Amino acid sequence: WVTPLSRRQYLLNFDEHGVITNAVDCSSSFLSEIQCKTQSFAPNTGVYD
Amino acid sequence: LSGVKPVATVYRRIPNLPDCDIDNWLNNVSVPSPLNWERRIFSNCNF
Amino acid sequence: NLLYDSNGNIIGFKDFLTNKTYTILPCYSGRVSAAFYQNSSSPALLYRN
Amino acid sequence: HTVCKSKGSIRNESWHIDSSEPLCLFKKNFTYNVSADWLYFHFYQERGV
Amino acid sequence: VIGDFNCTNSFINDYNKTIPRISEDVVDVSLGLGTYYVLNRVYLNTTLL
Numbered sequence A: 001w002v003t004p005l006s007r008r009q010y011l012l013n014f015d016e017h018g019v020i021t022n023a024v025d026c027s028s029s030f031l032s033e034i035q036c037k038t039q040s041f042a043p044n045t046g047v048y049d
Numbered sequence B: 001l002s003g004v005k006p007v008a009t010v011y012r013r014i015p016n017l018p019d020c021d022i023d024n025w026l027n028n029v030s031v032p033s034p035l036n037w038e039r040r041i042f043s044n045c046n047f
Numbered sequence C: 001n002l003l004y005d006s007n008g009n010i011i012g013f014k015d016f017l018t019n020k021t022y023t024i025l026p027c028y029s030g031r032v033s034a035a036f037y038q039n040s041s042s043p044a045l046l047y048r049n
Numbered sequence D: 001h002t003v004c005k006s007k008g009s010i011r012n013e014s015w016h017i018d019s020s021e022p023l024c025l026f027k028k029n030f031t032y033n034v035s036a037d038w039l040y041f042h043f044y045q046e047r048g049v
Numbered sequence E: 001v002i003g004d005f006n007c008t009n010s011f012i013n014d015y016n017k018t019i020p021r022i023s024e025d026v027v028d029v030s031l032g033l034g035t036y037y038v039l040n041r042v043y044l045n046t047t048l049l
């Protein structure tokens, strides 16, 4: 199986042992864009444009 | 007031090509005669 | 073989020849605060912190 | 084409013809799990690298 | 057509019933599938973009 690639922007979470736990594609949904612009998986309460 | 570069440098890099291993072929247990003079070409390696 | 932080700098590495780890520490680079009178031979230096 | 080495085939492996060893820039062997089920790879280039 | 040298012409035909198939699965980067580690960098307990 082959799929094309594109220059995207992803957010990576590292644990204490340096193992990637979860990732969020910033071009998937609006909550993903909020997590991208806040640089965190638990964004605070606010109005994001 | 004002706020030197030491010449000591540390250069480490992983090689991209294997070793030539010329000493293994020269120290072989089989020594060819002057009439044979076997030949081995070494290329794309580090020595 | 290298250790990086969230800011993007390197703070450690591993040697593949001796199998020993190290921590890269930044080197000192600071200035001196000197107090000088109207007519004096040498001012008074102060290395802060 | 690629010829099976476990059970053989009717053809011979022929994908390059070189009398001597050509100029190479990279050469290294890697090992993986033989009993694996699926493999994943990533190939890309940027700025000639 | 890849190369420009004649190496074998034993059995060459024109088959016209070979169509690639499309998989039924999609890309899911939630658990980490589809993401790759950095070249040689290690990150411990950090969230990197």
Ligand SMILES: *[C@@H]1O[C@H](CO)[C@@H](O[C@@H]2O[C@H](CO)[C@@H](O)[C@H](O)[C@H]2NC(C)=O)[C@H](O)[C@H]1NC(C)=O
Pocket (backbone or CB within 6 Å): C016, C017, C018, C019
């Ligand atoms: C550094 O650690 C690596 C990993 O264990 C060592 O590589 C091993 O060396 C032994 C001895 O020859 C082999 O039996 C293993 O198969 C090697 N493992 C791998 C993954 O290559 C290496 O020798 C160590 N280096 C030093 C200087 O101690």
Ligand SMILES: *[C@@H]1O[C@H](CO)[C@@H](O[C@@H]2O[C@H](CO)[C@@H](O)[C@H](O)[C@H]2NC(C)=O)[C@H](O)[C@H]1NC(C)=O
Pocket (backbone or CB within 6 Å): B018, D027, D028, D029
């Ligand atoms: C990587 O592995 C391949 C396959 O095991 C090696 O190719 C072999 O090379 C030897 C020496 O030239 C030949 O006698 C064998 O017939 C080759 N095997 C195959 C399947 O082609 C290759 O040399 C290895 N590379 C390194 C750098 O060790």
Ligand SMILES: *[C@@H]1O[C@H](CO)[C@@H](O[C@@H]2O[C@H](CO)[C@@H](O)[C@H](O)[C@H]2NC(C)=O)[C@H](O)[C@H]1NC(C)=O
Pocket (backbone or CB within 6 Å): A016, E045
């Ligand atoms: C991993 O990182 C988290 C987030 O920075 C650390 O959690 C903080 O720990 C400090 C010290 O105990 C607390 O004062 C903060 O309130 C914590 N923040 C959160 C959001 O929990 C955690 O300690 C780190 N773990 C290790 C082993 O370094």
Ligand SMILES: *[C@@H]1O[C@H](CO)[C@@H](O)[C@H](O)[C@H]1NC(C)=O
Pocket (backbone or CB within 6 Å): D033, D034, D035, D036, D037
């Ligand atoms: C290779 O994969 C099989 C099946 O997934 C597994 O049982 C085996 O432990 C793996 N080998 C190693 C060295 O982990």
